[PDB]
Design a protein around this ligand. Structure first.
Ligand code: GLU
Ligand code: GLU
Ligand code: GLU
Ligand code: GLU
Ligand code: GLU
Ligand code: CA
Ligand code: CA
Ligand code: CA
Ligand code: CA
Ligand code: CA
Ligand code: CL
Lengths: 376, 376, 376, 376, 376
């Protein structure tokens, strides 16, 4: 993920202009090959027209160029790009939100699956490892970068996500369908066993674990569904064909004609279509947004960092349920125990934020008349 | 479902261009008949104008062609297609998400409906079979492909989803309305019976089953509502009439006139309207996206694979509640038991992802001054 | 509801074209009067110009027609129609989803309110009748078709939804506000009484009933809010005025002038504006979509079938809680008891769906090198 | 709220046209001053050009008018209005849905907080009064109309929402932030006290009360957030400046020039720009939709009726928890006790809805062949 | 946050016009530098053309200006701005809703974590301080203004959010990932300890605390995800390049040419492009909306007031759980105890709202015939 949230904290003078000097995740990186190809075809026809074609041939070419410039309908392309890329971006953010995290589960497991002894550690660590394992299986199913990390189940077993015994159980399942759900059913069964052994002290806590498991499993399944159910291929081919039709019309119709011939609208020869190359860069970048975001679990630059999230989720979950279980600092009175009001100090940098009026509501400046304040 | 998620993992040079060489689920497959019809009418008028019509008749035709080219308003068509097809695509994804799956139920039933004996197997397998049966009834109601698979309730009984006794109970219901809800009320009653027999060990687990059943039943009902409440037929007729009005204006106005007559904008005769055929292909494909997605449970190529999902859901649910019930590998210490930090190994392919700075937040590079860090 | 989901299962050659031959729910039915009025004004001005107006008068008219054709800005109308009708369609689908159904409640009541005796039947049937009665009161408040069915509370009492005693209690409430919520408070009280008498066996089941009641009551209230809070009348008047301004500009500017006068763009006289009538039909149909969907509980053809839903909901709910309570077929082993895998047979029609590769994930065809598979 | 849901039940011939004859909540009411101002500037320049400016001055003015007509870009204005007003309308409906209602709470309190005696009445009535008081405090914070009704906390105390003792407790809180949340914490504490005294008979019912309280409090807080976090002022200034730029270009460029001068496109002098005034009325009404809906808690005509909702919510909640507590009609057999099927009678007006085929699903008309029905 | 909700309560004559006179949060403040730069380049080329360029050079420049005016395609820019800025505004409101507040937690903790003694105060105050501390850690991670307030964890410790002991525990965690989740796991553990000590009186109340904690923690994590997963940098660069391409075409093509040369469309020389500067101001302000809203936790004027929310949330939460715990005014009969109906008095200002008909539903004015009211 190319994060530039810091560069755009404040609407500054440079603002988005400075973002034009970034290379990773950029439009330049995604589009320079297509821009050179577009420019190569344009200068190939330019060289043909200037040096190769004869006078009759040049006249015919100019008639074709005037004809093709008519069909460079940028409004249809802008419409269909707008709608398609809006769909793809929304789907992209939905896919990011559908990635499983153990955060709700780790809060619930640290709060509900009890025991300072090795068994309690085993239960808590095993419940999160199941959650992490379900996440890893679905990600290696849907992510190229996680597949290259875990090309085999042996790789998942060596990485500590799955034990050898769990690998035997997992392979011995006679299922021809993706088994990402298997750790989730193991999690259900183990949470039931924990509640039967009294490690979960109450039936509502078991219900809370199973609710949070169901949310987690839902996210893993949603990843699977987004992977399988692509943005319809007809819809994609339609937008690609739209853009390419526009660029063929721009590749022929934006050819600079001889000012000698005195064609209307063709009286200046810049030899390079600056504005047509910028339109190409704009529209092709707009489609490259969809191209990058259509499968966000590839290995792009704005593609999701699925291997970083796997490592973070594992380490954090294990901290939360093993090192931070029942490891509270002693309840001691906070700084504002004796103070009726409560306000942390402000730094010299942000002290200016003080003395700005505290918002109470829009209606607290009306200043009615005395007569209008009396009830009926 | 034509899944091309792998082909678009990374925004590559080929990118969407290579997707133009796919046939299944493609714009070519959905639109070649309409393209040949469009082209047939265009060349029928072309042949009429070139060989059949007389000189007066040819002049009149050219006046009509110039008149019709005025009315080829592509911006209204792009607007209404954009809005209608956006509606249809959103509805299509909603319908996919409203398809019932037993995944939440199987986690809950493996976790809550207990017993290693044949009765416990019966209860768990029967609860999921009820869920699968409710799904099959609604799908054969809404899916053409599942109806051809299950043309009669006898077919559902032979497929193992409904017993003969359950068929007698199901037919003996005096209801003239679709009975997809019947297995869900059977599921409610059986979960109640399981909780009364103590197979469900706690009242919260029964509540969890009924919550998950209600979600499942909601999905089945939602499938029914999407099937019944079509995208309004007036709205569809409006977009079809829009597109056909544009194509009639393009079918007459894009006719190539004699350059001899010296009509403005008509001075080149290509004999085939490359750009008009591409516009037709673009706009008709855009409407074909809605046509394919308007009922996603047909038997298209991007239509949902409802028979695959039926088979997967059945097999997986039965595995989850029968073979994987209380079948945990023994709790043993994972690979990272003694390690304070936790990190799976990375392959040579994805080791490059390492040594990239771990994201902490946008604000961790501000580097304030010493004086501005002091509290007031 | 005009359901055409079957006609559009597959993207066929005819496809949406055949939908142009439907009359119910159609654009023709909704728009033929307005089309004849538009055409009547157009031919009234045509007859005035051709036979009534003098030569000076004809010249002035032609100057006015050329002036008015300038103002036929179809892009603003397409924008505002797009946005307004998108709002109205989204609101329409939201209103359909906000119609109350007893399906969650009937699953919960069959599962939670117990007793084979007449009292248990009374409790279950009375809880659903309360839910159905709340639905009927709000629908007769918001639906014209249900109001014509239930013009008085006496009509609701005769229909079996409300008893005479319940009518006395319902009228004796000193409330000047719509009392659709009254059965919901009766449902709350009766569920409490059932739980006190032990008919609901656990406090979590009572909580489940009250949760499902709250969802039901929320839907009824949402119907009330959608009825009361119309799409803002300023926004509607704006789109109606937009469309009518465009049609006045098209009614004057699309008048066919004498080719004799040799006006530019006016050199052919078709005597009937085919393309202008199609634009009128397109844009007026687009607004007629909003007109039909703005109050979906009227008595149109795409308006919701609220009387069918009332009858279905009542019959089904009563079946679910009375005839199907504790009426399970005996738990017997299903067809796939002894089979490790589970797969229903496929028909000759849909056997082709088999032998298509089972989807596992996008990443299962990468085929890495041996060296890149090794961990660091 | 100007409710016209009845007038638009059916898509009638008059339809939206008759809505153009409404004054309250109308575009006329919101825009006649701006229309007269626009028209006053237009006729001021018209009078200047016709009677005041000299021949040279008139020529210069006409050059300026032709120049300004070029810049009347209606497509950008339509784009930005569309997007901004769509944002404002969505926000408006969200704000309406975020208004607190006690309906879920009253169902839960009538069902959970028990006692026929004065103490039970006190507890139920006090819990709803707290909810109503939280609603009144946030509304007087965000609503102008409720602020004019409750200009002081003394006004809330006189209205019966807050007792004098509760006023002392409420003022004695050392908080400089809006205290709308205070009754919600009182509600939490009182529900806890009720559950401790056994007035709430079970811990799940207390959980249900607190869940419903949290939803209520969330709605009150959401009202506060929508009040505080305005639609960004830069975004508003952008759309206002867009519209005013268009209207300045239309105010100069739509000036009728002398047909004598023989300017192209300026050959008819209507002395009043009918179509330009309609465009002004259309676009300014479109922005007036946002202007009316941007703060829906003002005192407009489409602004929310917050004082009606306060009175309804109070009266209804008090009925629900005080007069209708444990006040059921005796469980007696309904009209359809002995009938296997269940169907209320239909009136002569709506009997036509009968005999229309009952919808079962799209797939129930396929009519397969005998050979295709056989399983593999 | 620049709140102008009061200024736009009613759609007044001034309305949005008066909002053009605001400076904070305004388009003027965000855009005057860019406007002066645009104007500086425009007048630099104007001075070059008028005084510096020779006659041949002036002719060439005018040919370039006519060429560049062709490429000033405002419709593509309006499309892509519309879609991108709509995305950014929606994301901005989502980010505001994803900011954590303790309001649900404070209601639940005041209602569930009991004890008037110092230990109960410690538990309640410590649970909210954990919630506030989790909020402060994530905000200092994502907010520049909170980072300048809390540049170090020492600053958080001095502000009273974290104790020294909690700081030792927090630093001793071997995690390389952002530790905003740490107080949430402390909250889970402490709520478990409270429930074990009997301070939480029931298991459902513990479940309610953990549910509300999970919502809170979800909001904190969502803040982290929005911070990390920027709006794709390719999409931003595309819109910035679009706007800058349009402004370069407007910077050259909107240059005023000599009326002497008699170029079409260039016959008036205003020396300052009023309308082009307004278009620049409109489009650049439209992009400045995204620029301001793209990271709403900066230190702008419409950026969120994160330091005010930190102070409010802390003070209010501590009031709610410490000063207002079990501090109810004595249950006494409200003003409407003996009144069957319930209605607060109305002021002279808002008494006009009375006598307006109380809304009952759209269907209560149909006035059917006697014969049509009879059941079949
Ligand atoms: N390995 C990452 C690459 C993404 C990036 O570099 O931002 C993935 O799975 O997508
Ligand atoms: N039988 C599948 C066909 C879909 C496909 O082939 O993708 C269905 O029900 O839609
Ligand atoms: N009586 C139905 C009519 C709808 C229809 O015929 O589809 C209603 O209430 O809307
Ligand atoms: N007093 C109402 C006025 C709204 C109306 O009249 O519709 C309010 O608070 O907005
Ligand atoms: N300090 C505030 C500044 C916002 C404002 O001034 O409105 C922040 O964190 O964004
Ligand atoms: Ca990608
Ligand atoms: Ca289809
Ligand atoms: Ca209607
Ligand atoms: Ca308002
Ligand atoms: Ca910002
Ligand atoms: Cl619960």
């Amino acid at each position: 993920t190319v994060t530039y949230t810091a560069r755009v904290a404040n609407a500054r003078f440079g603002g988005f202009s400075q973002l034009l000097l970034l290379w990773r995740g950029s439009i330049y990186k995604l589009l320079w090959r297509e821009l050179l190809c577009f420019l190569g075809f344009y200068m190939a026809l330019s060289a043909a027209y200037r040096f190769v074609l004869t006078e009759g041939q040049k006249r015919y070419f100019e008639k074709l160029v005037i004809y093709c410039d008519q069909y460079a309908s940028l409004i249809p392309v802008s419409f269909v790009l707008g709608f398609y890329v809006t769909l793809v971006v929304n789907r992209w953010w939905s896919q990011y939100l559908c990635m499983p995290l153990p955060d709700a589960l780790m809060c619930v497991v640290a709060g509900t699956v009890h025991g300072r002894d090795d068994r309690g550690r085993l239960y808590r660590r095993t419940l999160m490892r199941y959650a992490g394992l379900s996440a890893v299986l679905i990600l290696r199913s849907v992510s190229t970068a996680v597949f290259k990390r875990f090309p085999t189940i042996d790789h998942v077993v060596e990485a500590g996500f799955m034990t050898r015994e769990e690998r035997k159980k997992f392979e011995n399942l006679n299922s021809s369908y993706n088994k990402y759900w298997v750790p989730c059913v193991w999690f259900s069964n183990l949470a039931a066993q924990a509640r039967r052994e009294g490690r979960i002290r109450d039936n509502s806590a078991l219900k809370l674990l199973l609710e949070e498991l169901n949310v987690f499993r839902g996210k893993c399944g949603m990843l699977f569904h987004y992977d399988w159910i692509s943005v319809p291929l007809v819809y994609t081919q339609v937008v690609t064909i739209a853009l390419y039709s526009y660029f063929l019309a721009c590749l022929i119709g934006r050819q600079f004609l001889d000012p000698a011939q005195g064609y209307k609208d063709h009286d200046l020869d810049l030899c390079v279509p600056i504005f047509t190359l910028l339109q190409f860069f704009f529209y092709a970048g707009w489609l490259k947004v969809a191209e990058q975001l259509i499968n966000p679990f590839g290995e792009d630059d704005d593609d999701f960092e699925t291997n970083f999230l796997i490592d973070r989720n594992f380490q954090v979950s294990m901290l939360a349920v093993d090192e931070m279980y029942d490891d509270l600092a002693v309840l001691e009175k906070d700084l504002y125990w004796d103070a009726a009001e409560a306000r942390a100090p402000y730094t010299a940098a942000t002290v200016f934020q003080l003395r700005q009026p505290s918002f109470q509501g829009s209606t607290f400046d009306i200043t009615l008349a005395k007569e209008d304040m009396q009830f009926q």
